[PDB]
């Protein structure tokens, strides 16, 4: 369709081989059985194969394979480059750039001096850092300059959410605040909690908040009013999930509760953890809970039955990510585990000779890599598929004498790291690492 152009315009020398002599459509069919590594090699045999191995609908299919789903445009005997091939190649380069590309020194965004970064958001090109310094800061992931400082809270910030230009914050001052991320202006102060606002989860137009007062509150992000109050927990509420339909909450009362928010009704009390529930994941079908009991329970939301209780960690499960029934759990036992929550299999433990030396503070993952951060001052890249250590993405000099990495967000091309120390050996700051190509 678009390869006939190149044929009758870059007239290639006659070829005496098998695929140059097939009807174009049949050569394309044959070349469609190859993997990109081999299509990429074939393109280098001769001018005829190069033109044929750049068919758009050949690569639209390979990109759909690796979940690309979006072409790349870049506005001498010339060439009509495929956007789906540029899209595929670009991704493989970003991948190899994370895995083994030289680490260009990061942008350092200094702020929240001598305090803790307690929450991190990363949204397009904006970063939001929250702190016990009472403030939040909005940054540009591109320039590294501080754009705004969200001042108004009388106590320390301890949770946050970000949709798009709306920032939600939680503080020890018992209040949540709705913010405009461009203007820096606070547009609502949400009153109702009687204790510190510990967690929050935003789904579209509503944020659910958990407090040290043992309650949850559902709020309208636009009208700034408080729609519901979920009462039933007996100790502080530490984690919360909200999919638009149920609220799932975990607390220091050893319990996980499932709610219907509209009716304010507790549908299920999930019982089994023998210590505080500290982290939660919910995909509308399964709720996944991690506790100081060293266990991670997988529950069925619609019945409240416990499907799996996943054992093996030895300490608090600090963070978890759930995606397509793959669970990644980080722990204070200095260990990251990849679980298959369909079968309960523990697919991998990340514990090399290059294992973390302190607790895991944060993690992120995608189809290729797990990214982990720790008290040891490091952020490590791991191969999801093999469980193997790849490399240290960050290695604070102060890691062993006080320097810690509190939190990471990753995009497809950048890594953001919240870094600091309780003892002054690390000035507190964000690090931005760029893994893009051209």
């Amino acid at each position: 369709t678009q390869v006939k152009h190149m044929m009758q315009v870059i007239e290639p020398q006659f070829q005496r081989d098998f695929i140059s002599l097939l009807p174009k459509e049949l050569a394309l069919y044959v070349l469609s059985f190859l993997e990109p590594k081999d299509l990429l090699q074939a393109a280098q045999t001769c001018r005829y194969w190069r033109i044929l191995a750049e068919d758009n609908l050949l690569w639209r299919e390979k990109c759909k394979e690796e979940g690309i789903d979006e072409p790349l445009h870049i506005k001498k005997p010339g060439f009509i480059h495929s956007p789906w091939k540029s899209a595929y190649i670009r991704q493989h380069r970003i991948d190899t750039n994370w895995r083994r590309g030289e680490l260009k020194s990061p942008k350092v965004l200094k702020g929240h001096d001598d305090h803790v970064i307690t929450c991190l958001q990363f949204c397009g090109n904006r970063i939001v850092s929250g702190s016990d310094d009472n403030t939040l800061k909005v940054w540009s992931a591109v320039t590294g300059k501080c754009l705004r400082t969200l001042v108004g809270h009388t106590g320390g910030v301890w949770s946050s959410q970000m949709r798009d230009n709306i920032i939600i914050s939680g503080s020890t001052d018992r209040t949540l605040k709705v913010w405009n991320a461009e203007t820096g202006e606070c547009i609502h102060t949400l009153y109702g909690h009687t204790s510190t606002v510990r967690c929050m989860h935003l789904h579209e137009k509503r944020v659910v908040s958990g407090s040290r007062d043992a309650t949850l509150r559902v709020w309208d992000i636009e009208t700034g009013q408080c729609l519901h109050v979920l009462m039933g927990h007996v100790a502080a509420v530490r984690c919360v999930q909200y999919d638009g339909r149920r609220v799932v909450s975990g607390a220091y009362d050893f319990m996980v509760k499932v709610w219907d928010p509209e009716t304010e009704t507790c549908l299920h009390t999930l019982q089994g953890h023998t210590n505080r529930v500290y982290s939660l994941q919910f995909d509308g079908i399964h709720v996944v809970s991690g506790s100081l009991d060293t266990s991670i329970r997988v529950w069925d939301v619609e019945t409240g039955n416990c499907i799996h209780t996943l054992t093996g960690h030895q300490s608090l499960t600090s963070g978890m990510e759930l995606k397509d029934n793959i669970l990644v759990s980080g722990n204070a036992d200095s260990t990251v585990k990849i679980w298959d929550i369909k079968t309960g299999q523990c697919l991998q433990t990340l514990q090399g000779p290059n294992k973390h030396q302190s607790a895991v503070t944060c993690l992120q993952f995608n189809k290729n890599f797990v990214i982990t951060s720790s008290d040891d001052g490091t952020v490590k890249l791991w191969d999801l598929k093999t469980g193997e250590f790849i490399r240290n993405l960050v290695t604070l000099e102060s890691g062993g004498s006080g320097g810690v990495v509190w939190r990471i967000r990753a995009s497809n091309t950048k890594l953001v790291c919240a870094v600091g120390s309780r003892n002054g050996t690390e000035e507190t700051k964000l690090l931005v690492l760029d893994f893009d190509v051209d």
């Binding site: 510190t196 040290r212 608090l316 204070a332 607790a359 503070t361």
Partner: peptide, 12 residues
């Protein structure tokens, strides 16, 4: 059991 190395707001 290396927890409480993770931050958490002070008590009131």
């Amino acid at each position: 059991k290396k927890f409480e190395l993770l931050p958490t707001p002070p008590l009131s």
